[PDB]
Design an enzyme around this catalytic site. Sequence first.
Site, PDB file in Angstrom:
ATOM      1  N   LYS F 154       1.033  -0.800   0.113  1.00 44.66           N
ATOM      2  CA  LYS F 154       0.360  -0.191   0.088  1.00 44.66           C
ATOM      3  C   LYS F 154       0.679   1.494   0.035  1.00 44.66           C
ATOM      4  CE  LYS F 154      -2.174  -1.042   4.078  1.00 44.66           C
ATOM      5  NZ  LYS F 154      -1.733  -2.697   4.187  1.00 44.66           N
ATOM      6  N   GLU F 180      -0.620   5.967  10.835  1.00 44.04           N
ATOM      7  CA  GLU F 180       1.079   4.610  10.655  1.00 44.04           C
ATOM      8  C   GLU F 180       2.489   4.644  11.336  1.00 44.04           C
ATOM      9  OE1 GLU F 180       0.567   2.008   8.448  1.00 44.04           O
ATOM     10  OE2 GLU F 180      -1.736   2.320   8.802  1.00 44.04           O
ATOM     11  N   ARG F 181       3.367   4.480  10.332  1.00 38.33           N
ATOM     12  CA  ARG F 181       4.634   4.669  11.239  1.00 38.33           C
ATOM     13  C   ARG F 181       5.099   5.164  11.170  1.00 38.33           C
ATOM     14  NH1 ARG F 181       3.948  -0.358   8.590  1.00 38.33           N
ATOM     15  NH2 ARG F 181       4.080  -2.046   9.340  1.00 38.33           N
TER      16      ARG F 181
END
Lengths: 479, 128, 128, 54, 466, 466
Positions: F154, F180-181
Site C-alpha cells: 500500500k 501508520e509508522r
Amino acid sequence: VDLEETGRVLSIGDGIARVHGLRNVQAEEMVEFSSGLKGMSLNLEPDNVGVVVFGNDKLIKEGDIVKRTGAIVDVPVGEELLGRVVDALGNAIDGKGPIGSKARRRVGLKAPGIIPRISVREPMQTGIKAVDSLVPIGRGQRELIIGDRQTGKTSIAIDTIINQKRFNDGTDEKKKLYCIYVAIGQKRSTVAQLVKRLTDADAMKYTIVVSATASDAAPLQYLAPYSGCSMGEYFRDNGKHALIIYDDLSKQAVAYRQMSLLLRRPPGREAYPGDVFYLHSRLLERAAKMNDAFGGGSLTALPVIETQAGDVSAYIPTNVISITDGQIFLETELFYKGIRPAINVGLSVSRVGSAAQTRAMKQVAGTMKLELAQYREVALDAATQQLLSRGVRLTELLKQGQYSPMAIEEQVAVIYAGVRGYLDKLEPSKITKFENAFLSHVISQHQALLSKIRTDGKISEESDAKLKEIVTNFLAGFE
Amino acid sequence: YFRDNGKHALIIYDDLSKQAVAYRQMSLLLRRPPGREAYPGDVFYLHSRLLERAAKMNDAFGGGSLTALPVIETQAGDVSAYIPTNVISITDGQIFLETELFYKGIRPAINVGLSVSRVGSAAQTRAM
Amino acid sequence: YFRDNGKHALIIYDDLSKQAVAYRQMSLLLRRPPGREAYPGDVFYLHSRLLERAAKMNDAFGGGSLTALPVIETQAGDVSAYIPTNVISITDGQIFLETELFYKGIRPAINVGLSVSRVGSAAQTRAM
Amino acid sequence: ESTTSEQSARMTAMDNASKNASEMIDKLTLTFNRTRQAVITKELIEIISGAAAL
Amino acid sequence: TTGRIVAVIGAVVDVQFDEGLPPILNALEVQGRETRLVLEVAQHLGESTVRTIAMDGTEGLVRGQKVLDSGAPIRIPVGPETLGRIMNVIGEPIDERGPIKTKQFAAIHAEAPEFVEMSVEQEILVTGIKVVDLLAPYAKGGKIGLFGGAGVGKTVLIMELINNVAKAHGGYSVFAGVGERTREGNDLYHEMIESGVINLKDATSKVALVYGQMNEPPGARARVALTGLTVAEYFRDQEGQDVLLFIDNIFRFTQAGSEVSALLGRIPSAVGYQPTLATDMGTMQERITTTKKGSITSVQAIYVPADDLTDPAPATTFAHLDATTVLSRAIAELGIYPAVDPLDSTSRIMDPNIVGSEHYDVARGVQKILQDYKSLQDIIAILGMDELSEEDKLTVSRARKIQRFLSQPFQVAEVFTGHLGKLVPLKETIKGFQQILAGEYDHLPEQAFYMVGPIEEAVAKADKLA
Amino acid sequence: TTGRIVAVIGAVVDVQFDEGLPPILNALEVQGRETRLVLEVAQHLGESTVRTIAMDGTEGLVRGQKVLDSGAPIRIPVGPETLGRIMNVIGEPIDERGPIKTKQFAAIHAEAPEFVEMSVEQEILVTGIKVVDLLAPYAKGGKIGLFGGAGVGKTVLIMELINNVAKAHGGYSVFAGVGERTREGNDLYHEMIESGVINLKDATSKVALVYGQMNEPPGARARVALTGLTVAEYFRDQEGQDVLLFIDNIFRFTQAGSEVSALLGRIPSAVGYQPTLATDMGTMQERITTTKKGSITSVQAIYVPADDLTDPAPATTFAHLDATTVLSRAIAELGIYPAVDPLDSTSRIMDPNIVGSEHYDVARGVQKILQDYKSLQDIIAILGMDELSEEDKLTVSRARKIQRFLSQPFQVAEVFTGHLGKLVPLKETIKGFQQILAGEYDHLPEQAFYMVGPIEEAVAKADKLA
Ligand SMILES: Nc1ncnc2c1ncn2[C@@H]1O[C@H](COP(=O)(O)OP(=O)(O)NP(=O)(O)O)[C@@H](O)[C@H]1O
Ligand SMILES: Nc1ncnc2c1ncn2[C@@H]1O[C@H](COP(=O)(O)OP(=O)(O)NP(=O)(O)O)[C@@H](O)[C@H]1O
Ligand SMILES: O=c1c(O)c(-c2ccc(O)c(O)c2)oc2cc(O)cc(O)c12
Ligand SMILES: [Mg+2]
Ligand SMILES: [Mg+2]
C-alpha cells in the site's frame, strides 16, 4: 481515616479490584495494597476506582486498604539491571539482592515523534548468515520473527544476543549493543535455562531479562514488554544502543484478551478487543533510531509472533506485520527437513535494513539473493541446470548451528566461496563439511585478510584477489 | 429399581439432544450465563450424572445392571458440535449412522469403520 | 400515490443492504438488543413491510400499480447468506449477477439458473 | 516402446496428481478448521451481545 | 467464622459472612448435610458476600444454611499413606478402605517454584523403554503428550512407566483421573492391583490414585488435577524424588475450566473457551518441574477436539509439552508392543547439546532408516523384494530388524503373556540400535530382535532357533 | 463556564458542568497540564455531565480536575503557512519550527458539500502504472482507494503515486499520516526536503503534512483524518485549486473509532465494531471530494484486517471510491508487483465513451483471458498442464504472460526489485497488451514479460535470454 490518599476494596474477583475512596489518584497511577501487591488505577468512576492487580488477586479481600503511590506506573531503569533477572515491575528474581537503580521511568511513555529520528544506518549484526545477508537489520529497526511453535524463533534472538560480545568486549562504544530479553507467557524453566545459556556464553553481563511467565498473572504478562521497553529507552535516549526481544507478543495479546474479556469489553475477531493492535503499535513505535541531535542512540526490537499452522493471514500476525519493518518467517516444513535457520526467504523482508548492511556483505549477498531468487522459480537444459546446481549449494551455506554466531567478515568469506562458484563441482552433502574446514582455516592462517575486511568495511580489489587465491588453493587441497 | 434388585435393565434415551435443548431453555430464561451454542456450563454435568447411573453391580450388590443407549442427533454429520462432543466423551462407545450408507442400501446404516465399543470382546460369547 | 390513482410507478431501492445497516445502527443506539449478525430481530420485517407495498391494484381500486426493484449487495458471491435470503424470500424473484460471468464477457452478468421470476409468462407479451 | 513410455508417464502423472491432491487436502483442512473456529466464536459473540444488552 | 447461604444457582453458591471474609480459593464446609459439601471461594462480590464454586451437588441447600470457613484452601492428605489409595478432589478416600492416615496435610493451591528454585539443566528421565528413550526421550520435570485412546496398550504403558520409574529412579507415581469415567476408574483400579503397582496386602504400592469423576460438578473436575499434583508435590518437596504425574486427561481439565468460567458469568473467549484458558493451564503446568530438591514429570493424555491441532485447547497445552508419545493402532496390529509410533513421537530434548552426539546420531539414523524403508514400500508391492540394489536390500533388512528391536516385553504384562519383562538401560538401548545400523547383525534372522530387551537377548534368541 | 472531571477510562472522559453545558463537538481544555490536552464533546449524558474523547493520553488526570470550554470545535491553522510544516491532530506544529502563524483557523468538523456542489466531470489521471492505467484507471479529482492486507504494498504504491503524479503537479498537496509508522513520516519528510517539494528556507513548499500515527491514543487517531482533510478543504475552496490528498492509512480512523466505542457505552455491532461505523465513515469521507469550486484528487491507503475484504471496515469503504486498487497477498507471494488483483480492481471511468473503445476493449480482453485462466486452475492444480486441450494451453500461456506484463518495477522499490523503476505511457500500455492478446508473442518465454516497462523491453529481454 483518609479517603483521598487511601481507599478500601469494595469487591475483587475478575482480576479487577473495585476501590472506594482514593479521591486523589491519577489515571494510570500505581497503587499499593496492604498485602504488598501493586496495582494500577485504570477506571476512575464517580463512586469507585477500578484497579488492575499486578499479581495474584487471591491475596486481596474486601476491606483491604489501598494506598496511593503518587506515581504513574513506572519501573527502575539504568545500567544496574544489566546481568539481572527481574519481573514485570523491576523486582529482582535471581536472588542476587536489590537493584542499585537510581533512575526510574514510566512504562506508558509515548514514542519519539517525527523530528528526533533518522533512517536506520548502523548494522545490528545477528551473526546469522541467512539474516545478516538476506534480511539485514538496522539499529532502531523493528523486525518481526514469526512462525509456528518450535521453528527456531527464540534461537534467532539468542544467537543475536550472544553475537554482541565481540562488540561489547572491544573499546568502540558506538559498536556496542545492550540487550533486553522480555519473556512473556513462557515456561519459567525455559527462561532459567536461557539465562544459564547467556551466562555460559558470558553474554548475560550486558543483558536485562524481564520475566512474566505462564503462572504470572495476566496483567504481569501484559505489563512486561512495556517495562523492558522503558529500560531500553534509557539507552536510546542517552546516546547508546539497545536491543529488545519480546518473546512473545502472541502470549501477551492472549493475556490482554483475558483482561479485556474479564472487563467485559466487547470481543471482536478471535474474541480480541478492538485495541489489541494499539497494544502492540504503541510498544513497537518506541523502538527508534535517534538522530545526532538527540544523542544518536537507538532501540531495536525483535518482536516474536507465533502462528498457527503457518497462517500469517490471521488477525494478530497481520497486526504485527503491519507495525514492524519486515519479518523473518520461519517455516515448519523447512525446519522439519533440517534446513536451519528455517528461514523462508521469499516471505521474508527487511524494509529498512539494506542501508545498514556493511558494503562487504552487499558485494557477496546481492548476487546470492539473485541466485536464490532464480532457484525457487525452478524448485534439463544447461542454462537452468546451473541455477538448481548453485541454489542447493547456497542453501547449504546458509545452514547454521546454534550458539556459534559469526563475525560479519567470516560470513562474507564463507558466502564468497559460494557466489563465485567455488562449490559448483562439490556434492551438496559435502558443502557443510567444506564450510567448517574452510572457516577455521582462514581464521587460523589468514587473520590479516579478515581483519582488513572488518576495518575497510569493504572487499577491495586487493582483498578480492587475495580471497580468490586462498579459496582456489583450499579447494584443490580439500578431499 | 431393577439394577439394585439383582435384575437387568435396558434404557433408551430418545433423545438427549432434545433434553439438552429443554434444559437450555430453562437456564437461559433463568438468566444463567450462556456458553457455546448458548448452552450453560452445567450441561456436561447434566448428562454425565445421568449416564454414570448405568452400571454393572458386583455380586455383593445383587449383580444387577442398567445398560443405557442414549440417542443423539447430529447436524450435517458434526460429531464435534457441543452436545454430541459431551455425550460421545461420556459414553463407552458409539454406533454412528450415516445417510449416505443408508441410501447406498447399507441398512442398518452403521459406519463399521467409525463405530466402537470399548467394552468389546468382554461382552461377546465365544461363538460370536 | 401513482399506485392508488390509476397510474403505474417503478421504484428502485439502491440499496437495501445500506438501509439495513442504517437501521441496525439506529436500533442498537436505541438499546434494542442485537440479533443475528448484530442486526435487529425484525430486520426481515424492515424490508417485508416495504416491498409488500409494491402491488397491482384491481380495477375497482383504480387499476394502478407500484413495481419494485430492490438492490442487495452480497459479499464474495454468497446469495445463500442470511440478509440476501431474507430479501430473496420477500420479492417475486431475483436477478443474480456474478463477477465471474461479468469478466467472462457474459454481460449483463446474469446467472440464469439462480435467477427467477415468480410471475413468469403472465408478465410477458404473447410474442415474447 | 510406446506402452513402456505410456505406463511410466501415467505412473508419474498419477503420482503427481496424488501428491497435489494431498497438499490441497491439508490446505482445505486448515481452511475448514479456521472457519470452524470462527463460526463457533461468531455465534458466541452474537449470544453474548444479546444477553449483555438486556 | 461462620457465614450463611444467600444464593444457590446450580453449582454456584453465594455465602455472606458477618465478620472477616474467607479469601479467594478458601475451602468452605457447608453445615447440615449427610456428606461433605465443600465450596471454594471464587470472588468477593462486595457487601460481605463471596461467590463460591461447589465441589458436589447443591440439591437441598437453603438460604440461611450455615457455612464454616476452613481458614485455608482445600487441604488433602499427603504422604506415603495415600499410595495404593483412591481419593477424590477434596482428599476423601473413595476406595472404601477407611481413612487415609497421613501425618501431613497440604493445600491444593500453591504457587509455582520460584525462578531461583529452578534447575538450569535439562536431564533425561530414563524410562527403560527403548522407543521412548532412544527416539522421543522424556525430560526430568517435563510434560509429555500421550496420544492414544483405547486398545493401543495405553494402560499397560502407564502401569509400566509407574513400575520403571520406581525401579530405576526410586520415584513414586500419582494418577489423576480428570473426568474419570466411573466404569474405567474401577477397571483401572483392578488392573493396577492385578499388575502389582497397587498392593492391598502389604505396602509396596507405587501409585496414588486421585479421581475426579465425570458425574461431578465442573469445579470438582477442574480441581482434581491440583489435588493429584499436590500429592505428587509431597514426594518431590519432602522426599526428594523424581516423581511421575499422570493426567487423564488434560483436555477435560481445560473443559472443566471452561465450564466453571461459564458458570461464573465470564465472557467466553475464541472457540468458546474460558478467557483464562492460558493462565488456568499456566498456574497448574508450572508446578510440574525440576526443583533443586527433586522433580515431577507429567504424562498427560491429550484429546484433540475435531482433530484440530490449532484448537485453543491443544494449542495452549502444546506450549507446555516437552515430548509426545503417540500410541498407534496401526503399530499394535503389527504386533509391536509398546505400540509407540517411532516417527510420530517427538522430543524437545532430542538435541546433541542435551542428550549427547552419540544418542542423537543413532536416533537420527534410526529415524532416517525407518523413513527410507517406507519410501521403498511402494516399490516392494510393485517390483518385489529381489529387484532392489545391494544397498537397498540391506536397508529393508536393517529397518525391519530395527522395528522389531523397538518392541519390548513389559514386566507389568507378565501375567497376561508369561514372558519375562525387561527394563533396558539407556546405554544398552543406544548400543543395541547402534550395532544394527553398522551391520553387525545382518546375518541374524529378523524375528530374533522381536519382543526382546537388550541386544544380548537378540543374540540368545537367534542361537535358540534350530 | 468551568467543568470538573467526574470519570476517566482510557481516552473517554466525563466532565460535569455547573452552569453552561458545552455543545457536542466542542473542544474542552483540561486545566493543570504541561502539554495541551483537548477533550472533544461526544455526548450529553444528562445531569449536567458531558461525555468526551481525549486527543492525547489521560494518565495523570484526577477526578475534580478542572476543564474549560473553548467555545468551539477543535480549530486548526489553514492556508499557505501550513505548507512545508508538520502539524498534529489539534493543529500544533510538531516539526520544531515554531508557531504556524496563519490568518485563518478552521474547525476540523464541518458538513459535507451539498448535492448541488458536486462535479460530474470525468477525466483520466494517467499514472504510468500499467495495471492501473489499463484495467482500473484513476480520474482527475477522483477518489482512489488502495486496498491491501499487511505488507502487500500500500505505502510503496502511494509513494510511487506521489513520485509519478505529485512531482509534476501545478497545485498543492496534503499528506495525512493516520495510524501508520512514525518512521515512515520521518522518511517522507526528509525525502521531501531532499527533493524540494518541502523547502526549509523558501516559501516554495507545495506539501502540507498532518500526522497522528500508531503511537497516538485512539481519540487522536480517530480525528487526524479530519485535521488533514480540513487543511485540504481550505486549499480546494479558498484558492479554487487542484489539490492532492494522500492518506495512509484511512482504515486506522475506523479502528480508532472502534477502540473508544465500547467506552462510550455503545452496544457493539458486527465483529465488535462501533454501531456507527458507516455513518462515521460517511460524514468523514463525503468531505473528501472535488466540488464545483475546486478539485481534490484523493488517494487513500486502506488496510484490510486479517486479509478479509468482507471485514466491515474495508467492505464499507468500497462505495466511497471512484477507483479501487485491490492488492493481493497471493499475487504478491508469486512475486508479482505491484500485487494488483486485476479482477478485483475497478474504476468508474472504465467506459468506452470515456477511455475510448480501444483502451476499453484491450482491458475487457485482458480481463477475460485472466478470468478464463482462473476457471482452469482447479484442473491444473490436480492434473496439471498436460490434461488441457490445445485451446486451453494457449489461454494459460497468454494469460501467464499477461499476468507478468502487469507487473512493473517501481522507482520507489528499486532496492527490492533489483531493477530500474519504470513509467509506461498509456498508449504503450494499451499496445503491449493489445499485442500479447493478438498472439504476437506466443513464441516468447514467460520470464521475458516479468518486471519490465514497455513491451519492447520484454522483447529485448527475450533476446537476452539467448
Ligand atoms: N540453528 C539450529 N540448528 C539446529 N537446531 C536448532 C537451531 N535453532 C533451533 N534449534 C532447535 O529447535 C528447537 C526449537 O527452537 P526454538 O528457538 O525454541 O524455536 P521456538 O519457535 O522459539 N520454540 P517455542 O518457543 O517453544 O515454540 C530447539 O530445541 C533447538 O534445539
Ligand atoms: N511495487 C513493489 N515492488 C517490489 N516490492 C514491493 C512492492 N510493493 C511492496 N513490496 C515489498 O513489500 C514490502 C511492504 O511494502 P509496503 O508498501 O510497506 O506495504 P504495505 O501494505 O504498506 N505494509 P503495512 O503498512 O505494514 O500494511 C516492501 O518492503 C517490499 O519488500
Ligand atoms: O470473521 C469473523 C467475524 O465476522 C466474526 C463476527 C462476530 C460477530 C458478528 O455479529 C459477526 O457478523 C461476525 O467473528 C469472528 C471470530 C473469530 O474468532 C474469527 C473470525 O475470523 C471472525
Ligand atoms: Mg521460543
Ligand atoms: Mg503501509
